[PDB]
Paper text:
Many protein filaments function through dynamic cycles of assembly and disassembly, characteristically using energy released through inbuilt nucleotide hydrolysis activity to perform work by pushing and pulling other molecules around. These dynamic filaments have been termed cytomotive, to distinguish them among the wider class of cytoskeletal filaments that perform organizing functions (itself a subset of all filament-forming proteins).
We thus used a different system of reduced complexity: bacterial tubulin A/B (BtubAB). [name] BtubAB heterodimers form four-stranded (4pf) mini-MTs, which exhibit dynamic instability and treadmilling. We designed a mutant of BtubAB, intended to decouple longitudinal polymerization from lateral assembly interactions by introducing multiple mutations into the M-loop because lateral interactions are exclusively via the “MT” M-loop of [name]. We termed this mutant [name]*B ([name]*: [name], [name], and [name]). Right: Single protofilament/1pf polymers formed by [name]*B M-loop mutant ([name]*: [name], [name], and [name]). Using cryo-EM, we resolved a 3.5-Å reconstruction of single protofilaments of [name]*B protein polymerized with GMPCPP. Our explorations of simpler-than-MT tubulin systems therefore appeared to confirm the straightforward conclusion that the conformation changes seen within eukaryotic tubulin heterodimers upon polymerization are not determined by the multistranded nature of MTs. Using three different systems also strengthened the case that the within-subunit conformation changes are shared between diverse tubulin superfamily members.
Author numbering:
A (entry chain B): 2 to 37, 46 to 78, 80, 84 to 273, 282 to 426
B (entry chain A): 2 to 57, 62 to 282, 292 to 428
Amino acid sequence: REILSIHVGQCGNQIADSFWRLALREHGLTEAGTLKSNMEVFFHKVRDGKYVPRAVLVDLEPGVIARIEGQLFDESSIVRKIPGAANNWARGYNVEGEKVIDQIMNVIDSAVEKTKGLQGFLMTHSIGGGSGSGLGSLILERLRQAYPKKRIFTFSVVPSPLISDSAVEPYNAILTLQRILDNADGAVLLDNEALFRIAKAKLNRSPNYMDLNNIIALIVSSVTASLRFPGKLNTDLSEFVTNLVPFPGNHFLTASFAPMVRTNFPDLARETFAQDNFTAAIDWQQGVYLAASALFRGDVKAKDVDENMATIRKSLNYASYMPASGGLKLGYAETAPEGFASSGLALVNHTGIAAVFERLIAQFDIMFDNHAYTHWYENAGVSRDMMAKARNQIATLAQSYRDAS
Amino acid sequence: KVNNTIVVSIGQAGNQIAASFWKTVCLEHGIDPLTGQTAPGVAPRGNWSSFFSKLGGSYVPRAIMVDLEPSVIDNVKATSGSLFNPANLISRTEGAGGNFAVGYLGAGREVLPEVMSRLDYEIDKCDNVGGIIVLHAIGGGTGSGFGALLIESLKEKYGEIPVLSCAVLPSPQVSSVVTEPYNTVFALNTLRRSADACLIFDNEALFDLAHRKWNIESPTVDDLNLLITEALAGITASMRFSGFLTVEISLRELLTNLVPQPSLHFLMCAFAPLTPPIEEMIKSLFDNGSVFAACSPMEGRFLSTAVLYRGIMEDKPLADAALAAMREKLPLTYWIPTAFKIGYVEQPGISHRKSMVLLANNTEIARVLDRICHNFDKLWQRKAFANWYLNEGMSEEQINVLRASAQELVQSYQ
Ligand SMILES: Nc1nc2c(ncn2[C@@H]2O[C@H](COP(=O)(O)CP(=O)(O)OP(=O)(O)O)[C@@H](O)[C@H]2O)c(=O)[nH]1
Ligand SMILES: Nc1nc2c(ncn2[C@@H]2O[C@H](COP(=O)(O)CP(=O)(O)OP(=O)(O)O)[C@@H](O)[C@H]2O)c(=O)[nH]1
């Protein structure tokens, strides 16, 4: 019952920013850690008012970590590394990754050596970067091989379909998703344009990344809500692995939070499992649900949760191997985020997230055949053969989803 | 001194139902549940030694609680205070998480020796133990796995002590874990093999029983565990109260009157009256929906029914005639004519001045398990969620054997 959070990259670090901005007052503390329901799973005991979130903000070209420290973290565990991230996965893996992995894993095993008992890791990053992609992949590699009995969860922002912020980001995405496969037993994928449209629906003016990462932060908070807010029908990360991962390598999740508030519970539950409310733009029409976890929290009523079966027997489409009334991991938590009397999270193992994967595949299917940006990898130590086999693994995973329909 | 009964609770549903169970039992005996000490100037009503013990002193319950995650045990401690012995409370961290194999071969194996150290410590303090009640949900992982390991090692090392199980089944309205079919079938095998008897609950049945028939627009699981608690209090009142007109019924005698054949030992239960705090009440006990399971038992076939009344009895010949009249229009098996055990308790429950509990053996429960087995036909035709069962220690052939044993039970019913 302890969480070590890993934050690599600018996107992952802003996700972490918003994540603790809401997690601190979700337990009644300010952003700086001052006191204004076992909340010690995320936080280490340092001072009676300062409950320190032990999360490593390791990131090449730090830049943003300065504005992170301006909300107080543990300054010893985090590092503002010498810059030079670029958007190269190999540059975060073996060029400058090899000169930071010893220090970051010394920090990590010092953080977990003082742990009474650990459940796993929740890493927030973006697969499309160069720091959060390559450094995250290296951390996954040397963290699975160090603690094979622990359960790494990755909250990765997949690059947007409509427009791109990096010109080599599908290379990075695929060659980090391969490491997420080979090194983690759980993954929640985030898509940016879905977050933009959700925040457009939620608010009345134009949002930005801070609102998107607030939504992502609500997602991550409700992921572990049943673990740190013990009510009835508790949920654990081991339970997430057991009942959301039907096959050994199929552990990529799409997440929706509701509402977007003294709302009527049927509306909250039917809008929680809404095809347009999920935070990753995945394939719903042709896709089906493998394993949906409904984690409701706050002013939730057990009969209300269990009687909202209209949205499951009407809107939710399941695979052939799951029972019609099954496919639900139900969870109750006594505490919901503020502004919500009762709120809900849908964590779905779904076929349509493979569509997410395949769009990166599509980009890789046009770049590798044209020798597009591969010299940036070859001169950095990552050859074309390992990129090809990483894409082969990712395509096999997407085909596993397509076969699991 | 009277025959003893140790209630070991495993898993979240088992531990919370047990918390409510000894809450209501203590307030039936006049004992404060949140403290564990008797009320000053008030003697414990009935045979306290059957389910409790004078620990010097306090009227402590003889309850063993184990859960592979700390949250449920901590919640039970917060809602119950110093009622239970902290030594009898055993907790782990990582949990089982819907995985039977964790509680069977894994963390369950390493947590087992301390659990039975506390168990045989408790049973050595018993005068003449004649039953052990295992309160759990077989839908979950910790509940199923450690209920299996615990009852199996009991029946291999003991075996003269009857075992009554009280397992919460998955609701056909909604599942709470997607591996509930796995856990339920895996623990159902050992309930058949090891446990001498089993009691079955179902959540959404209690929901519809507590929504319109309790006047709450949306009851929580607290009211469901409260209904199960009323059921258990009525059932164990035969083991808890003595006197002239009332009859004492041990869990072994209840076993004998409820279990004609070794494999026919899964029980249904119902409670009456269905009103917030006689012939209409007689039919209220035996309504098609009054049972605490999602089925209609009146198209099934009652093997044997223990009808335990508790409260004032002003019309005992008229009520016996009412039971005789109702027996004509109820589905009873021809091979046991003495299928009605009419148990009496002078002291009623706290909620009602007079109440009855039905504890029946019916064939319909099999079709209930069959739909769970039907759910097992979905997760096993595709080999889904079974990687971690293999990784923790179970096998393809072992799972096939366990499912075949569950089917053997279902076909033994019909
Ligand atoms: N949905 C969100 N996307 C974000 C957020 N922050 C950044 N991004 C986007 O993620 C995508 C790539 O993430 P990053 O480049 O920041 C990951 P990293 O810092 O490791 O890249 P480099 O430092 O250049 O190596 C890009 O579209 C960013 O604009 C955010 O808070 N939410
Ligand atoms: N009548 C009650 N039913 C409950 C209660 N708590 C849970 N349940 C029911 O139990 C069923 C699920 O079983 P659990 O997960 O609680 C048992 P366990 O903790 O051992 O599972 P794992 O933690 O995954 O190992 C589900 O239908 C719940 O609605 C309760 O307090 N009362």
